[PDB]
Design a protein around this ligand. Structure first.
Ligand SMILES: [Mn+2]
Ligand SMILES: [Mn+2]
Lengths: 415, 415
């Protein structure tokens, strides 16, 4: 029987015509998360509650409902229950949910639980905004020049988990097929060879890029850059770029800039000309360091997005405070983006900034922009006040060391 | 008939027992390169000649022999001759060669010429050393902490170029096979879907990692880090890491550090304990910025190596002066690692540092360490003297702007 307790006081969020109908007392499911999730989640719940209390003068209140996935799920539901069917059901049912870090066990043949949540709920958009918070210790000279929003495709690519082990009957069957029926000659060593499949479809590309352009319009952003490796992988990465440009022309009236290949899309609300461009992935990894100001909204495939989001997060000193969301047409799951750091679990020491900023993305998604704005204001003030957790403090002079919970308070104090 | 002219005075380098037998007058084939290759190559030839002249007091001299590939090949041999069979023959025959930037035409279905050279000559090692040259304008606060050597697998991965276009009969045939015969259920959108194959074999992994460990030993380096995405791609990326560790244990007497997974390999020459470790690729992209000093020799797959080498190059202000080599068991091809920058072609303006440093790797490979040391010394002095090309000068105050050829001279002047 389920151990999830539906809050007595609280109402389910609904969806109509692609628009969320959020009540003043929405029930929001939440997954504590493994390791440090035990530290960061409580801080997040408190910070969010303070923000909504302050924003709406007590008129609104979230009814938190704990659901399970990861190590805590096995302890709650038993041995092999890492991701209960009900968790997928609950998230879809309640439309909006948030979670702490999740880790996948090894030795049992289980694949990434985070990817499982994304794929099964068809949360095709991995949204990762990366900006700099003044006062954050950064390894680069000008982190303030970074203000990007990453739209990472979440349902395709080699991330789909389609592969076969070297020397397995399956791997041999696939390789035999490729060489004998497809006439593949480029497999250098066909024996003791593992094989992986990289898919990229038009509908997959289009829906991701459509969300990216709509975001640029809704937020009056300057450009959308399609990042890819089309010079090497023409039919997957290259096709992604092609379809992205095509979508811009076919659905957003994209016009040609100069002699190409860049396009301009008129923002139907502000009249601003949004530039649609593209950059090779490896070169992009260099450009984000050398010319970050030239970039804004980014649309890319799964793997590249993973790399880009992490590299960007590192550069602005936000490795531990990078917010993230997994969005689909029916529901959305916000999440801490860092690891579980089991060594510090329960020490009330780690930075709760990632899950908190992911909660602010959640609040904004719910249309509760005022509360979200309060969290941003709180984070900015606390960091600028140099009252921070160890991960920041260690790289600074004259900073006040704060525990995880205390930093949560500092955020509230700066709202 | 061939238009390649074998130098009258000069002798072919030979190979015996995996050791190059280099004469005092070796014939070295060279490809000018497209675009700025017309600017950088002449500077390289002059710098190298000055270095060997100075090092061996006139006793040794390279007999340069021009060979063709790229745009110049079509102009020399005709319309469809982008990569002549003789070029592959010449490189293998003469054992050591160098080249400027190469570009691949689009619209003709031709795949990367650089990859073609690597694959066809089985140059399985893409060696990319990245260090900081004092005085180089860098976007990071402490670029001097970066001193890494990248061993990028060059014959496998999605880089192999195995893929099929969306809606093509082939793509449909492969997808049908995967779904109906392999029972694949993770292809989100099977229609209008491009497909790519990612292979990774044991022999491919082992030979790359073997070269990496041997390099760490020969150069008394501190560690070898296997970079991979094994948490997501278990059978390719994960297998690479597994085989890498296995090779360390089976061939280099690797012993377990603590409770694992790190290993220690005793340097048979210095007694130094070389640490063998591994890091997830996305996290590595962050670690190179946050903790670069903890890394040294890196061994990774094709695509990841491409990303890692570029990101590292950018961080140390070496985007345009990053040396590179493609090494195999029978021959080696050194190359400029940047693009062709056609806009500046013939202006004697671009930085010849990349091809020059690649020539120093070439000289060292030939056993001409003294000449190679002279080039390093020259580069260090010129950069530190702030007498540089526009790409550096633009990011500095109080620097003396030098043309491409003039920077070549500056290098010579600092030998
Ligand atoms: Mn990640
Ligand atoms: Mn490259």
């Amino acid at each position: 029987e389920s151990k999830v307790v539906v809050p007595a006081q609280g109402k389910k969020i609904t969806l109509q015509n692609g628009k969320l109908n959020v009540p003043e007392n929405p029930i929001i499911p939440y997954i504590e998360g493994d390791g440090i999730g035990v530290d960061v989640t409580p801080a997040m719940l408190k910070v969010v509650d303070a923000a909504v209390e302050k924003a709406y003068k007590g008129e609104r209140k979230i009814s938190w409902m704990e659901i399970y996935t990861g190590e805590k799920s096995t302890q709650v539901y038993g041995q092999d229950v890492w991701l209960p069917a009900e968790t997928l059901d609950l998230i879809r049912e309640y439309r909006v949910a948030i979670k702490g870090p999740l880790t996948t066990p090894v030795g049992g043949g289980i694949r990434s639980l985070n990817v499982a949540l994304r794929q099964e709920l068809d949360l095709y958009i991995c949204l990762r905004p990366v900006r700099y918070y003044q006062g954050t210790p950064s390894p680069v000279k000008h982190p303030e020049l970074t203000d990007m929003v990453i739209f990472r495709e979440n349902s395709e690519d080699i991330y789909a988990g389609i592969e076969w082990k070297a020397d397995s009957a399956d791997a041999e069957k696939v390789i035999k097929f490729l060489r004998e029926e497809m006439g593949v000659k480029k497999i250098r060593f066909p024996e003791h060879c593992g094989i992986g499949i990289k898919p990229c479809s038009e509908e997959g590309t289009k829906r991701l890029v459509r969300a990216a352009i709509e975001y640029a319009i809704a937020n009056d952003r300057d450009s959308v850059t399609l990042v890819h490796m089309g010079n090497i992988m023409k039919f997957t990465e290259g096709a992604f770029k092609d379809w992205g440009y095509q979508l811009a022309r076919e659905e957003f009236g994209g016009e040609l800039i100069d002699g190409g290949p860049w396009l301009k899309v008129k923002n139907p609300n502000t009249g601003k000309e949004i530039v649609i461009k593209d950059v090779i992935a490896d070169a992009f990894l260099q450009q984000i360091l050398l010319r970050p100001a030239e970039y804004d909204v980014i649309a890319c495939m799964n793997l590249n997005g993973d790399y880009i989001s992490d590299a960007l997060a590192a550069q602005v000193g936000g490795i531990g405070i990078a917010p993230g969301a997994n969005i689909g047409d029916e529901c959305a799951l916000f999440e801490a983006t860092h690891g579980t750091a089991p060594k510090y679990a329960g020490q009330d020491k780690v930075n709760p900034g990632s899950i908190i900023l992911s909660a602010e993305m959640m609040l904004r998604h719910m249309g509760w922009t005022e509360a979200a704005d309060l969290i941003v204001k709180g984070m900015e003030g606390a960091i600028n006040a140099k009252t921070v957790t160890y991960d920041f403090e260690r790289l600074m002079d004259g900073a006040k060391l704060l525990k995880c919970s205390e930093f949560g308070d500092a955020i509230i104090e700066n709202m």
